[PDB]
Amino acid sequence: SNIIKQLEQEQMKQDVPSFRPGDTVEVKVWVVEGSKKRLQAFEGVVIAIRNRGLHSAFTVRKISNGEGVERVFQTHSPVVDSISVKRRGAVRKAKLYYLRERTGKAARIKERLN
Amino acid sequence: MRHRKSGRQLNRNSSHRQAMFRNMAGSLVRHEIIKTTLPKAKELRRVVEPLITLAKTDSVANRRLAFARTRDNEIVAKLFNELGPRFASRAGGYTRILKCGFRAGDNAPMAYIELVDRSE
Amino acid sequence: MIGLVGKKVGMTRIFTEDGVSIPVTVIEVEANRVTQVKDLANDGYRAIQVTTGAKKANRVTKPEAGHFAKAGVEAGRGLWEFRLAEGEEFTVGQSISVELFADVKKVDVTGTSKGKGFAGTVKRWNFRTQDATHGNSLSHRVPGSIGQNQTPGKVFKGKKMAGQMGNERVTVQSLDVVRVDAERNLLLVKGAVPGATGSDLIVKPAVKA
Amino acid sequence: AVQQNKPTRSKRGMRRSHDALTAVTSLSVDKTSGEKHLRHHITADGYYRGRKVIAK
Amino acid sequence: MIQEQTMLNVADNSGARRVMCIKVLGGSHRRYAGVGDIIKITIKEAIPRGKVKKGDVLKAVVVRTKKGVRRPDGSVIRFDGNACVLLNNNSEQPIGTRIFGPVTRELRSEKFMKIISLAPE
RNA sequence: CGAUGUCGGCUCAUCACAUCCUGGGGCUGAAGUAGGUCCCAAGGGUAUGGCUGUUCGCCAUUUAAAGUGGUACGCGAGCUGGGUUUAGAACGUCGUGAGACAGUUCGGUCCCUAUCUGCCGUGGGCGCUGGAGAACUGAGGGGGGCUGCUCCUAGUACGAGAGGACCGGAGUGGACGCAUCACUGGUGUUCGGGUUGUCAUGCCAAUGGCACUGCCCGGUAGCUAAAUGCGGAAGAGAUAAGUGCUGAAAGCAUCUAAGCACGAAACUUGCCCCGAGAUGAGUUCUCCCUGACCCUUUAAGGGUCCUGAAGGAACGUUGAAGACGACGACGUUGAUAGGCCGGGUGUGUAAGCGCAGCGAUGCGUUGAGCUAACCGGUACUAAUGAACCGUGAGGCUUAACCU
RNA sequence: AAUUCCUUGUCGGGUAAGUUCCGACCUGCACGAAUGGCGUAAUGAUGGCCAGGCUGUCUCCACCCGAGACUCAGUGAAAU
RNA sequence: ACACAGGUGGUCAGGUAGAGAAUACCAAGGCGCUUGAGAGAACUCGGGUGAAGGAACUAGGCAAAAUGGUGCCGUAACUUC
RNA sequence: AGGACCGAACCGACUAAUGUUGAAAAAUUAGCGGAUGACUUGUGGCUGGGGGUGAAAGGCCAAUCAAACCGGGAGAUAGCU
Secondary structure (H helix, E strand, O other): OOHHHHHHHOOOOOOOOOOOOOOOOEEEEEOOOOOOOOEEEEOOOOOOOOOOOOOOOOOOOOOOOOOOEEEOOOOOOOOOOEEEOOOOOEOOOOOOOHHHHOOOOOOOOEOOOO | OOOOOOOOOOOOOHHHHHHHHHHHHHHHHHHOEEEEEHHHHHHHHHHHHHHHHHOOOOOOHHHHOOOOOOOOOOHHHHHHHOOOHHHOOOOOOOOEOOEEEOOOOOOOOEEEEEOOOOOO | OOOOOEEEEEEEEEEOOOOOEEEEEEEEOOOEOEEEEOOOOOOOOOOEEEOOOOOOOOOOOOHHHHHHHOOOOOOOOOOOOOOOOOOOOOOOOOOEOHHHHOOOOOOOOEOEOOOOOOOOOOOOOOOOOOOOOOOOOOOOOOOOOOOOOOOOOOOOOOOOOOOOOOOOEOOOOOOOEEEEEOOOOEEEEOOOOOOOOOOEEEOOOOOOO | OOOOOOOOHHHHHOOHHHOOOOOOOOEEOOOOOOOOEEOOOOOOOOOOOOOOOOOO | OOOOOOOEEEOEOOOOOOEEEEEOOOOOOOOOOOOOOEEEEEEOOOOOOOOOOOOOEEEEEEOOOOOOEEEOOOEEEEEOOOEEEEEOOOOOOEOOOOEOOOOOHHHOOOOOOOHHHOOOO
16 A cells, blocks of 8 residues: 555665576675674575565575575565675576475576676 | 455356356457346456457557457457457446346346447 | 554564564554543543544434534544543544554554454364365364263353354454654554454553553 | 154244345336336336347 | 474484484473474484494484574574484483584574584574 | 164363362471472363273373363264174184184174254344434453463572572463464465477467366465464452461450451452343434324324425445345445556566577567556446335323423 | 283384284193195285385365355255 | 166277377267356365475375386396296 | 286276265265186076075075065964054
8 A cells, every 4th residue: 555655665775786586695694693793694596586565585595514594585674784696697487496306516507697 | 265356256167267258258349249147247347358458559469469368360350450449549448337137047137248339 | 541543554564773573563543533522420431432534424424423513523434432530531622643652662452353254163263174084974174073962961152163253343462562653643563463454443551461 | 854843834934034025116217218117227128327238 | 393203314423314303392292393492302313333322312402494493583594404413311412523504593592502612504 | 672873082072179280278207309298279271102992001201280080981963983793704712513702803884954952153023112323331241361491589598518499570482362464484276487298270480278277386465374473461359278466255375256467370350352132121422303184982093185304225336244134335526346557566588570590499679578366546337317115393100490 | 823811921123112013932721734734936906014205194274276055046855 | 767977789990199999189970968047155075285294193004195108227035946 | 828917998896985865776986906718798598496506605596585576375373562
């Protein structure tokens, strides 16, 4: 509605790139360890869909220890702070959830170019 | 429940509906007016106007891609060419409806669905 | 303080700098000016009653027009009593707002639940589903038993099974004050409130937790 | 189940209280059709507020 | 996950393969769950070289929940393992001397210190 | 015995207290600590598995605790059919035999659309005394009542130490409920795309059809849990067991006889929902009707004429409302649905055309096209327009006020 | 043991925990050689058991699409 | 007993794909099954899908699921070879 | 070659579900087994009730089977209801 649009513009205050999945990213997030304003790096594999306005999603494949995580990024949370786009590619699907199953090697994808 | 869902089953499955609507679409173009069950008309309304919107704009592409939405040469030939100037006279609302009461096979309220720019 | 009747008109969640984004529900207040009064000179009560306006002045009847005009003009689609014994208010419209709850920090929020209607065992009374195909013969969403045998001979009054969901007033208590916006007439509450969009809702002060 | 006992005449007419057709006061007049017609439908000569819908 | 069964991974050098839960502790008939809680375990397979025996009853902490755990805004870290760190059963100490696997910040909080010094992410 | 379906399970409970836990105490061989035992206490809560047809039992591991017993050893016109016990069959055994088996084993039709009572909901009349429309008071009824750990107190009291509280407070969970899709997800045949086969659209291309949604991925709105929020309180009042003062009978003593004081999750409240058919029909506010006649035991009316209102429903258009009614909203002085325009969302570079490649196909055009149930706006279409139903200043008695 | 009452016998294996199962032991209530004994590869809509894959069987139920139910109109039962 | 979702033998045996009288979609050819119309509940039936777990279910993994073709590899206990 | 294997036709009925005042006095659906034979089926033929037949269940012999059905003895008899 108009009345949750005005409010929603009130909370739009990120200015961000455009992320077309197959994005490599390095997310730098406020940990708040023991009142530390350190920022921890999360190079991952974008999969999930952004927008739904305000509320957005992104997610990681990490492959830390032969297996990873997913970590939903919002791109409007302060906890997010700033998000690097890094390498991007071309892939027809907007999700790469067959990368949870089929894992490495087929994690590779084609390049978007510029 | 059906809270903020629209789209009736009507008679059967969606697979009946899409055939059943395509028939009635073309029958509308083809003969001007249709007398049928009052729910039915007010459901077919929703999804035949999108042929009519595509057809009040000149496009070759959108004609063939508008034949993904119809089948029959004739009705996409009437559309655009003959029912184009009919519907170049407006945007929005390409039928009047009006109603006509119960049917003589069993009591079932009927309405109408008919073109408004010729109906004189 | 008293609660006043706004309306929920969406739901959001609003970020804070410490990294929590609490759930929110954006109730929109719009003036609630004091129309009818109920006093202890007339015994039994010491409420105050209010308005929200209404779309037309043709959509209500001559009785529903009179009572209004005998307290200024402002429309009304409703009136909701709000007991009080002190925090006195007065019969002339006052147009009071969220501004109340800037010295309150707990609230209740007391709207109307949406309901589904039909109800049913499992779907409303939360029973188990069994005999899916392991010896199926009707048994899924059945209540199974509802009673015993002849040494009660009957089923007690107020036994759950079938009936009705919602379409009634409801509250869960609390639903704290998060932001008081008295100038856009937004009230940002903490978590999900009573009913779907378009429901009227009081927002009393709790002291009940 | 299969009932037991015979319901009484009373118990019939008691259900048939609620059985009846709504008297709509069907006949009505327009100034576009003075016909004695059922409102919000056909006049039997196509009109609804005037305007013939019928071609049959 | 499920109080009964589950086949959990070892996120730690000791033990190997499938490791069964038998009760998600906290009790009162705890339904599913476990994210960073201590849970009564029975190892089903154990490391074939080196010994802490199979079939023993121990305890473990689930640090890698495939459904997910989350905070501070409720942003969910969804694991792809189902792994835990085996723990002394009469106590609470890690028996495992190396830990590999991402872990939860809910173990940073409160007495658990030992776990989160020996694993990264 | 003119059929009262057995056990056990499942499902669904509900009651009793001879109480398992929480609560409150007495005694203690009551160091603390957890207890032991007994008294009071049913408000609430009261475990999953392994084996076995068994309930039970035994075992495993929690849990605050996994109470006991009753309800046709609770529940088959709700489910199951494994056991016992149908007819088959077999072993061992018994029997001369046919056959037999509270020994054992494998296999082996579980029927019935509810009239009535009862319950859970929900309307339709009439009533509430002129008739209406709203808003309530709150008599009553229902819901709800759980609890660990950790941190603080305090490493204090206690203890030789080891160990380690009470009282009280805070915090974070578990189980259960309640609410809600905003977040995280699921579904999403009604949205988009890929794709297998084939058939069609004259043919190519591109599509559409059909194949359990053909197969398969993602997904909108809505609904929903596995998600998220919130809830069980404090505090009163009157008490129980209990603990007491004061205190005679019975110069003392004595919690009781006179009189007073505290005292539990019980109870009455406080909290939430239903709630004036609460026929004891309550109350507050407002609105609409203030014309004639006639025939009667006449003050009780019946009928007739003129008005017919406020308001209702009907009807239509429909709703995060809905089995149907109901309720909610609107009916052209309109945003009520749909449509349209724009937005948004989801997919992911349409088609065609041009170029490259022999081709398959790629690239460019083009983060394109398409896109609902959404949102915003906009009368484009239908909400037409009469009507209908509902009447016509309020019975008697008495008090008070008013000429 | 499809044979054993006591009996969940007893020991071992498997199971986190195994009245069954499996291997043994022999105290064979009340096994036994053509009313065939003991084995047995192959076979089995065979009995029992375990394990893998796999799963809405369950945890713990949800939504969806259809056919009813529900409502209208026509027709029009039943046992009792 | 019915214009009964059942039973009933021989003969003819088309295209494409496919091993095929499978099956899928089409012929030739013949049909929509003699109540329709609405609302889309609960509940029942019939299907489809399910985050995480994966037999904890139950008398019992019953059902479903998942497996599946063809070519090629490679193949153990045991054995009446 | 094979009472061979996998599997349509055909036959048969192992599981479950739905039906169980049905659609139907035994069927339907999804699975299932057998499948050139100890097969299966059409046509016709043949065995008769104290009898047949039976890869054997007291099964089957016209929806009836531990002695069919129909007529007759016969209004059997019933100390029974």
